[PDB]
Amino acid sequence: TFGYVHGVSGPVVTACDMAGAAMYELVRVGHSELVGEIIRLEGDMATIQVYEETSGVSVGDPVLRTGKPLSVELGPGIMGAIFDGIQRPLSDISSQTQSIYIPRGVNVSALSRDIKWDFTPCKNLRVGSHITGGDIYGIVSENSLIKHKIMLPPRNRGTVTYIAPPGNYDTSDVVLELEFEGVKEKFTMVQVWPVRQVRPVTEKLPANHPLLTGQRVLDALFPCVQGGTTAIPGAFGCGKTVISQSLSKYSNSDVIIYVGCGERGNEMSEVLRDFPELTMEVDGKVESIMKRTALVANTSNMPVAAREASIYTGITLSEYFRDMGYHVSMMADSTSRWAEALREISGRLAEMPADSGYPAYLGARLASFYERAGRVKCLGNPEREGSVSIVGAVSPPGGDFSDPVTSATLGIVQVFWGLDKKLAQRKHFPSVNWLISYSKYMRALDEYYDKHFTEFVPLRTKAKEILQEEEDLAEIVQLVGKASLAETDKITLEVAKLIKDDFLQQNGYTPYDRFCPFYKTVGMLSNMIAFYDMARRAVETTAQSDNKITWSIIREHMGDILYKLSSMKFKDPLKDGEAKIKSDYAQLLEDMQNAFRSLE
Amino acid sequence: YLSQPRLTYKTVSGVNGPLVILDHVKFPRYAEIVHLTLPDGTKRSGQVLEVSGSKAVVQVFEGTSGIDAKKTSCEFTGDILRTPVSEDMLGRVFNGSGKPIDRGPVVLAEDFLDIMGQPINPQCRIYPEEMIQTGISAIDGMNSIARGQKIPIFSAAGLPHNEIAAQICRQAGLVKKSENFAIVFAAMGVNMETARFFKSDFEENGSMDNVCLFLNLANDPTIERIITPRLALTTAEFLAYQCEKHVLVILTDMSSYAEALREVSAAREEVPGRRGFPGYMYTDLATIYERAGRVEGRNGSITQIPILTMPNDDITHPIPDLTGYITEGQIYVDRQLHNRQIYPPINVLPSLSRLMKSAIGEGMTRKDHADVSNQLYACYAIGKDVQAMKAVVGEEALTSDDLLYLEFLQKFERNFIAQGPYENRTVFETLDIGWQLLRIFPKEMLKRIPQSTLSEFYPR
């Protein structure tokens, strides 16, 4: 049960006398009992990586074998909690230490064993029933919004012997008892799951329902879904924080798990300060977002081995809340700073790199994490249906599209929102490329649009065609200079400029363009494309007749119709409403129809 | 109190580069400190990098020249490197290992502090929002700096990064609406005239009463540069979080530190990183850069301004690359602007400050700060993209407004950027010059400025 330290070099310890230790087991190193993980066996020597600082660890110190892998505790007390990569409560540590530091070997439990939770069992369960893994056997009222379903661990089954009456219990009180084969087993409100081990489901279903970000360029041209995998770049000022906060304030998610992997210490203080201040509107009332949010916090100076366990902690919390029947949306910021830790740990073990120093198993570890997202039919007796949507921020090492992390990621994800540096230099936000970005969900979303917004797909198609034709013409107008241009090219240019400046371009720091609902998006695009069609038809039919129509005698006639289009983005979906905005757009459509009928 | 006697081994079993290997050590502790006594009688100090069984691998701070394998005595301390710390350290000059070098006594300790630090709970920090008015338009106007930030100066060889550093140190204060900074200054591998420059500049402007210097010159041992930025950051942490003052830490040539890191990693036969630097250089620079900010309940702060020199003016080298992943922005000193007699030669297109958005605006500096900065940046970018093809294809094929961007280029590089090595501009003077430059364009070409701001500030 006790080995001894034999060598120490960096975060890697070598311990002798470790006979039956298993790989990836957890151990306690030294007199401070620092947690560590077995990453190599040889004879009866074991190689451990330590999740703390190893300064001052002598040769001969004890090493205690725990017998279990790296796990998380899952129970009531996760909504509103701030952890690190190992699920250590950063607020309980400060409250109990009364200090501004995190001690070494600090051993405090992730969920407080002191709070009394209001637990009511299920009505039809009773002594003698048959229960299996996944079944919901109680409900704890965690707060005003989130109801915490108490489930059975997925590897248990039996007949009920005792189940607790409604009341107030803490996470140490026994609530259920099962008998399988004459053996007995008691269950409390908390379970324990290994973070590197995926959680079972009944079935994985296809993703068919959108995930509204609020941005027009992403909701229209490059949609995400509930259960999708997305990759954005980590770029300051481009509009990434807008997305991170929009996922939380105004979306269709129930739970939000935000993971920071390698985080500038002054950019994590911002997140930790102004997340407890954000609010959202539910049933008229205004309620804090920290009632349905959990943060995993990891900065760039914490141990390297705790940097790579952050992603797993976050995705396991996500799966735990998915198995209740909720829709979770995880944000994993700086997947690149996670790959950096992978590379460093690989180097410390003297392994052969593959490309640019990275381990050869880089794609195999990114896939194992991205492929845990999806829409599922939850395991257990009540028919549920959950989903986890992962968004990963892959920062560039200068802006290369063939970084090993970026090229390994593009083989796995279904949506890619690209970064345009030329657009971020001209202060066009959000700086989405819209010519290299892609989404592979635009065919699974078809029967949703064909049922709710039945006229949107042609608008999207034509908008994309216009935006590509403009790019074709741009590097022609650059050299020659727009003298000899067909009138249809003039209309293409001057409608593409409208689409770029008034539809794709958005300002998240204003009280009307913070979250743009989808009826607003569809209405703006519909009016713009209707104008394009009308102008093109007018100029095309009277081509060889008398009084040749041109783009210049269109900007004369309808100069204020070209202003209600360039100002559709100022309507407000909370000062105005849905029917008011729809009426305005319909009136503008009739106006431009009358103008094009009169001029022609 | 460690009261047991110390153990002294005459059992050296190898000298190689900066490292000495010992056998028959009794329970070797990791990161321990060792005192070496050479045959003639001189004394050096080292730190244990790796223990394994009975072996210990010490790195000697002052080199391994003169050391043999039969008569050198290594005495083991039993403790990690704890430096003595006090408030009298202000006004004193030390060498790269903390010894007095100004004819003064050794530090009488108020405390002994571990030089690796102590991790600060991320929940006990405070977000920095107090702008520092450095008096430099290129920084104040477009790359503002909050009090508690970490923002380096990306420079090159032969460029005036010491002049910019000294001007910031001399002029830094808070934005005047109605004391001042202590300074800690570590120098890693500088020449004698750079140290002379900095000492003279500090003591000619009455500051020396409030400055602590740690100096490692280019004629000094190379392995000291590893502990130099950590004794300078352990004093700054005592002053700020125990004596409650506002500290400004300058770290000159964070490139020499990384070269010493590579030199120690290459002698240990480790799997190299990119360009030969150690594979753990990210986790190593992050334990230096992340010792900066404000904490809850204590009225002290630490601002950090490292100073790099990019090899071959390359910003994708490992050192600038990894430094950018850790610090909150960068100030970019350009060579093309230097060769045209511009001071300070700051290129604002790859410069950035990530804490600016929350330190400027109404009630902090002025309501038009962010829009003026954004429009100036966009105009400079468009003007560069014009000037490229203007020089390439056609001085007369330029449009009527493709000549306004070139006039903006000239007047912006000569009137906004170019400042003067002793000129202290307010923030509002910087903003007024920005408006005088933006008035070149008709108000229809300023798309990055709202109408409410254009109506109030453009017509003057």
């Binding site: 003297a350 052969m352 | 036969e269 190299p272 030969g276």
Partner: peptide, 18 residues
Amino acid sequence: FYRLKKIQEKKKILKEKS
């Protein structure tokens, strides 16, 4: 290439002489 071949050579020297 040369650095990685050096690391491998040192590995296969250590393991054989030890």
